[PDB]
Amino acid sequence: TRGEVAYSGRKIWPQKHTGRARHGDIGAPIFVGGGVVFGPKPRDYSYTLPKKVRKKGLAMAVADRAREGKLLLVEAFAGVNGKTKEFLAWAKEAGLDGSESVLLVTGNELVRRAARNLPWVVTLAPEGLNVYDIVRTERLVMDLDAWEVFQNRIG
Amino acid sequence: PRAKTGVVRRRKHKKILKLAKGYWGLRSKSFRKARETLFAAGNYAYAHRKRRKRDFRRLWIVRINAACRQHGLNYSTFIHGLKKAGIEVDRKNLADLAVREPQVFAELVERAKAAQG
């Protein structure tokens, strides 16, 4: 600000018989080296959104997917080992051919690893379900041991 | 996010200059002296567009008053004769008859002095 800058506090003109404008320090914000007037100060932007609004959001975020037809509930991932070979061979027989992006919600980290690294999968933990990561993808595929934690998480 | 002015102030000042190509000095080379004569220039555009409609009245009245004196009466008798004939002709934009094709006006003076003579 005007006060925080590393200038001085000396009145740079004696204000009366100079003829130029009356000015305080160079650190005044109208000077070109000066501070800024109202520039941003580092603040936390996060706020408590109500927990019922978060739960209703994560309900309607998957309700949109089920209302379209872009929801899938697999349990047995045939792709063990986290090989993206195994995951893409799984997706070919599953019905996620790759042109439409998918949120992948699995409690199996060795398929989160497989789908971590594609241009069309947002991998996700079963607890880290959230409406922004739901909506930014066009499909949703989740495990039975992620749908169970989601169903008992929301009302 | 610091939003520099940058491109916006030049795009405004070149707009004022492109609107003001033509005036005298710094009046049309100065992007803060050309607002001061685009304000007054647009104000004169307003007042003179509303003044053109009466300028041309005070031109056509002269053309009728000079063409009806050629036929031997004055304009103040002429329009009284026209409005007692009952018309919406000659309608001073049509003080063209009195200039060119003058026999139409030479019969309109007859229909004037007849209707008020």
Added chain:
Amino acid sequence: MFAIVKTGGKQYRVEPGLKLRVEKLDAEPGATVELPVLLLGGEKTVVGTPVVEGASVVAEVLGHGRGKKILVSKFKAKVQYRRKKGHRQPYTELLIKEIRG
């Protein structure tokens, strides 16, 4: 021929063939005849009558390619701390070709 026509509130002198901006009418398409009010005859042997009330018994025929052109306007007032720049009036014209009397 010679003719004088009131249409759209103003009065124009018209020949066999000419017309320009005519203060846009309520006749939409291109190939559209139109019956305006003749005023004073036209100085041939057959005609030449200045007509009371504009009640000339014959009309004209006015086909037209109607369309507003945008006009270089910037119709701005200014008093002061006041800048009402924002009125530009392209002022919808209508483009007549007239046929006869």
Added chain:
Amino acid sequence: MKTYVPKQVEPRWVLIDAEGKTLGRLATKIATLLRGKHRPDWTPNVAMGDFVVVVNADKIRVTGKKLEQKIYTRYSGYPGGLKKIPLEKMLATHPERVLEHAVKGMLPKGPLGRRLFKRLKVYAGPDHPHQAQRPEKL
């Protein structure tokens, strides 16, 4: 919008024999003649109309008593002098000018007014050594 304009018509070299007329009462005929306020071609920015030649000056009669009453002050010289000229002196020496000063107030003030004053050729008459050309409008 229509087109109205005149063109450069050959002028009207009107003579005005001014043996009887009072100036002013004459001169507003002359100024209305000088501008084209009598022909119906009149655009106000062309100085069309007449090249009036008013002749037969002094014995321009004037109204009731203006024998040393009408003061032609016009010439501020420039330090102490508004120098006054009555009409007796004006008609005595270069008469020639009471009409010029009568029409130079009834013409307008711009360059068209100044061009229009050069059309008016006042003489002390008759035999204005100027003419063979006289629609002598009276």
Added chain:
Amino acid sequence: AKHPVPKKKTSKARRDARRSHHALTPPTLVPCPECKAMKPPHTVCPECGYYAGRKVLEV
């Protein structure tokens, strides 16, 4: 700082009109009747000078 000072900036018009008569006059040159170089007049310029003139380097 003091008493006589310009009230206004002389614009391009009055400045470039006051710089009218400061156009330089071209010098006068005459062709030296011995050989054709352009001396100014009444001037023993570096050719010969006048007839039998005072020499730079010549016979």
Added chain:
Amino acid sequence: MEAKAIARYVRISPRKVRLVVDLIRGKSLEEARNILRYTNKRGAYFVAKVLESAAANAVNNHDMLEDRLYVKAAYVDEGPALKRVLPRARGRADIIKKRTSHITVILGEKHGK
């Protein structure tokens, strides 16, 4: 074809060179070089150097035949102003400006006879 000449940063204030280059704008070469040989200004040295250099760049580069050429266009421009200080009374220290110039005399042929 018109041979360019430009002598840049020639260090003479440009109004004072404009006053001599106006004298040679439009003149023939054998006329103009000996105008400059006796024109009593400082400009008439730098413009003389650039006129001789322009004639040489018309001959030895664009083969433009030294006799049949004149000065087509000729103009100087302000260059980077060397801003020195000239100290005054009461410590006022005004900024004297040694302006520099960019001189141009393009030279073209008149017509081949």
Added chain:
RNA sequence: CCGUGAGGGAAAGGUGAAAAGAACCCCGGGAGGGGAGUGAAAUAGAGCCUGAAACCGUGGGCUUACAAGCAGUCACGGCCCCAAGGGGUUGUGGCGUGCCUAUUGAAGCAUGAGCCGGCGACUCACGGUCGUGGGCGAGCUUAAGCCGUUGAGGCGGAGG
């Protein structure tokens, strides 16, 4: 750099892909050019990308040396550009007391402004008071903290 001193305290980035940063001429004392050459580009040629504006020039069109004006605008007319209609000029006419601030009032002979380019002034933290979009609704509701991430969020009812 200023200051004895404590102290104040600047400005100043960008060639190009690569220096291939211009061999050799020619003018010039040299600087600087013009060729040649480099390179895709050299009005990218060295404190060099883009390089605006103020400003300063040169060339062309129109225009002015009997004119009067807050510099314009409207109207016609003349003339070169495009050929329907335009823009550029401005000759004449008509009409016209600058901008901002402060004002009972400003063209004001009240104030500020040389011009241009940038920087430049209603925000934010926590509370409060009304509104509105929502959620829940005689219920509502988290805080710090805890646990977990990838720019996943839940648990936490102390309290209000």
Added chain:
RNA sequence: GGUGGAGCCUGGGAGUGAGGGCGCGAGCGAUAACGUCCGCGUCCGAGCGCGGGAACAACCGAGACCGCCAGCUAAGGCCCC
């Protein structure tokens, strides 16, 4: 009677609290001031934006959404400007 950017109420946001001319009623002043202080207005303020008043905030005419090379008019004029 009066449907009008009329009213009444609640709540939010104000601005403003240096006014001025004119008319009328008065005070102070001198039956002075473009004086000052009120009351009823009005107008400028913010409508000088326009017309007339030669020019001119408040005098007379009139409340400017924009356009038109149409018309009728108010105060004011009609010899010319």
Added chain:
RNA sequence: GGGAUGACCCCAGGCGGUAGGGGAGCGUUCCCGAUGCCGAUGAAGGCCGACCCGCGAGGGCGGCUGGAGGUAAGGGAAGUG
């Protein structure tokens, strides 16, 4: 009010404005949209435009200049004019 909604369609009025109050918008920087779509078959920028759309703020298109970034519709936060 007309509406066999598509509330576009007309109708009666209104529409000077300072302090102000209120409502619509256009822009600049950044972000989500974006691991996307444009872009050397020339980005941002600069100069123009007599064209186009918008009442305007501005936005498009075209021409050169530029030689490498730009970022849609809808939204969000401002060091926003």
